[PDB]
Design a protein around this nucleic acid. Sequence first.
DNA 1: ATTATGACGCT
DNA 2: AGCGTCAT
Length: 430
Amino acid sequence: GPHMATGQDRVVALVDMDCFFVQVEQRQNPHLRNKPCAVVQYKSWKGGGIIAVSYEARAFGVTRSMWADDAKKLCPDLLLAQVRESRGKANLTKYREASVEVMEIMSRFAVIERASIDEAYVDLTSAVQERLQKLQGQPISADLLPSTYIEGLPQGPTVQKEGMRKQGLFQWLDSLQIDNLTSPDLQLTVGAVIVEEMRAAIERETGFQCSAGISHNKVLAKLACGLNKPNRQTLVSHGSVPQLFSQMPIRKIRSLGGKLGASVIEILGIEYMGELTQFTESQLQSHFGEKNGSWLYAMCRGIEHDPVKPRQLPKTIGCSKNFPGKTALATREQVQWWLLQLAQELEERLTKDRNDNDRVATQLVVSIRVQGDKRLSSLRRCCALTRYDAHKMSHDAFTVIKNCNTSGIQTEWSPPLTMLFLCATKFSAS
DNA sequence: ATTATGACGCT
DNA sequence: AGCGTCAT
Ligand SMILES: Nc1nc2c(ncn2[C@H]2C[C@H](O)[C@@H](COP(=O)(O)OP(=O)(O)OP(=O)(O)O)O2)c(=O)[nH]1
Ligand SMILES: [Ca+2]
Ligand SMILES: [K+]
C-alpha cells in the first residue's frame, strides 16, 4: 500500500547508436549512405565475418555473425566496409574514437555510464528536476517529443506508423498531470524531452543517429530502447510494465539471455517475465540464489536499483586475436611474434590513453586458448605492468604462459594456440 | 572458422 | 587471483 516502494525514484535513459560501425563507415564514405551495408572483419575466409548491419541490409535477413559470402546470397547488392588491419589483426581505433565523440556530447547533459562502445546510460533525475523548475507548470507540447513512442499507447476506444506514434503520444500527454512536480510519469516525460535534445545534439555534431529508452531504471531503459529502432526513442512508464511483461520472453531482459534465464524457464515452467510475479522473493532466492532472487522479484515488477555509474572511460584496454583451425600457433617464433604484435597495439593504445585521460594501467592480464578447449579462455595469468613498452610486455606475457607449452622441443608449441589476449587493467591516476 | 572486445559475479 | 557468464 502506502509503503510498497514502486521503483519510480529515478529517471534513467539508455542511448544506443544505430548500427554503429556501419554509421561510422557511412559518415566517412557517402557512397554507403542509405544503402544495404555491413561492416566485416577480414575477407579471405568466406568473405569476412559481419559485425554490423545497416537497417536496409537487415531487411534482407543480413545479420551479425554471418559470413559476408552468405550475406551476399541474401542481398547480392550488399555493400561492405572492412575494419582496418594493423600489425596483422583487426584494429578498432576508428570506432573507439567515434565513440569518444558521442560520449563527450552525452556528458554535457548528465553523468553517463559507458556500457559499451556505442551504448551509454544517463541518470536524468537531476536534469529533470531542473527542467521542471524552469517550466513552472507549463504543459509539454507534442512538438517537444517528435521521435518519442509511448509504450502501450494508443489503447482503448489511421494506418501509418507515424500516425500511431502521434496517437499514442497524444493519449499520454492528455493524461498527464503537469502540476505535480513529483509525478513519476511527468518526470519521465521531461526526461524524454531532454533525451530528444541529447539525440538531436549527437546527430547535429557527429552525423550519427541513435535510439534511446527512457524509464525508471537501467533494465527498463534498455528494453525500451529496443522497442522502436532505428532513430526513435521509447518511454516505458511504470504503469506500462504489467502489459509489457505479460508477453515478454524472459530472455529479452538484460542478463537473462543465457544459462540463468534458461534455468528460470525450466525450473519454474514459465515463459514470460510477468509470470515471475507469482513467486515469493524467498522462492526465487531458493532457486537462483539470494542476489538473483531479490533482483528477479523486483525486476518482474519493473523495479531495479542498479545505479548509473559515473564512468565514461573503459576500465580495461585489451587486444586479442583468434588463430582458428589451421592458423593456430605451433612454433615459439610464432607465439612470440604475435604476442609482440598484440603488445605493440596495446602500447599504442595505452600511451594515447595516458595522454588523454591522466591514468596508467598497472596489471597485465595474459589469456590464451589451447586447441581443443571448448572454453573461450584456457588460461589467464596476471603480471605487473610497470612500463608501457611493447617488447617488455610481450616478453612478460611469454614468461607467464611459457609453462603451458607441452612440447618437449623448445622450438615447437603444443597443443597449438588458438587465441592470444593481452589486457591492461587496474588503472591509477597519473 | 566468427571475432574483437568489455563488464561483472563467484569463490 | 583465476575462472565463468553475459553481452554483441
Ligand atoms: N569486433 C566485434 N564488434 C562487434 C561485435 N558485435 C558488435 N560489435 C560492434 C559493431 C556494432 O556496430 C557495435 C555496437 O553493437 P550493437 O549490438 O549495439 O549493434 P549495432 O549498433 O550495430 O546495431 P543496433 O542498431 O544497435 O541494433 O559493436 C562483435 O562480435 N565483434
Ligand atoms: Ca547500437
Ligand atoms: K550497444
